[PDB]
Amino acid sequence: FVSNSEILKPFEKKQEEEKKQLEEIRGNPLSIGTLEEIIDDDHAIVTSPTMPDYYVSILSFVDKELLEPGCSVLLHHKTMSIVGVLQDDADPMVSVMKMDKSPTESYSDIGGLESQIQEIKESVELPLTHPELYEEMGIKPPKGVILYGAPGTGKTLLAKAVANQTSATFLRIVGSELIQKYLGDGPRLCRQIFKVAGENAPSIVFIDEIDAIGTKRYDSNSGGEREIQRTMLELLNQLDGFDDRGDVKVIMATNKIETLDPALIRPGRIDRKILFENPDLSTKKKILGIHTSKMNLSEDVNLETLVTTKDDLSGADIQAMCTEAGLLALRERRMQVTAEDFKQAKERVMKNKVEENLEGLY
């Protein structure tokens, strides 16, 4: 009380005086509005949402060199004087972005894909970790990277893992859905993405499964060819227009990369095109090892035995197998999972991958 009160009363007093004087002038109902522009006659033209618009004086709460257009400010009754400034609302990462903040997984949990991991690293994780090489040398780390592999198998895993390691907002775009089939929707959607990303940097623009603007055409006509081409061109121009060493990073994703033009990749910004190699034997042990941790099982299971008979199979297969084996236990009314179950799941997935007869198996 009393100890506090002696420091408190004057510390209270300077803030209160400023505040008092503000509130009297600021007296409600005061309409909130948007700065349209800040003018040559030192006025600001404002767009009022009450429908008039005005040339307005500023009361320096913070200065005009600290204020920019489109910012929200609080406006007087009629002359619309800037009585105080406001913080912006409804930042649009809740409308064009599906957000995965501090996403899961890491490099250790799929390890054995180690050589590819260094590649992905060198463009994304590593500049953050060690700025210095990149700065001293004067050349920039690749803005954007392309991952090709397959969903839930290796493409997605690498992307979760790296993004989390750099502690950037993984912001997930559905490529196909941009796909909106009418002249106005896509190029804006794309612009609005890039804008919000650069503002609230460092940020990951993850474009999932872009297959459908992967065409280029020699001539453009009509609406039926031009729409597609406008969307493609918008990505190409923004890249070509700006340059960033990691205010915006891009991961582009597609199953295979032979459906992307080499003139949309754009060497010299996107320098890395990184592959997906299958999990080998060491990796299978690992992928399994992580998935058997979560489990309650029987002691007759041999992690080793099942890996050895698997012929160079995808990380997907390994996930699938665990998921499949749990079901054979659940149906039989039990929580223990015997070896025989893992083996049946392994036999089934291994057959389907290794089916390709008379042209693979000649």
């Binding site: 420091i7 408190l8 510390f11 210095e132």
Partner: protein, 93 residues
């Protein structure tokens, strides 16, 4: 009083949540005025952040560097040099 907050680092030894509670805590310290308090905070933050490094503590100390209160800037930069120790250079460059 200066020593009480210094003491809290040593009390918060072996205590997982409490290390987290520090980030809530130094918030409280900013509310409370007084030169004795303003001088103490770079040091409080410095001791905790070299027996448990805090990105938040570095982020705050950069601002204290460019402080118009003389004693605060003094203590922040010595503190900041304490955090960067263990290497020569890093972010510290």
């Amino acid at each position: 009083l200066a020593y009480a907050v210094l003491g809290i680092a040593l009390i918060a030894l072996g205590e997982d949540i409490g290390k987290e509670m520090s980030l809530r805590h130094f918030g409280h310290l900013m509310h409370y005025g007084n030169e004795h308090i303003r001088r103490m905070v770079p040091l409080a933050m410095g001791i905790v952040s070299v027996s448990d490094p805090q990105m938040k503590v570095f982020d705050t100390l950069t601002r204290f560097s460019h402080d118009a209160d003389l004693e605060v800037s003094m203590n922040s930069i010595f503190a900041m040099g304490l955090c960067g120790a263990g290497t020569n250079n890093a972010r510290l460059a």
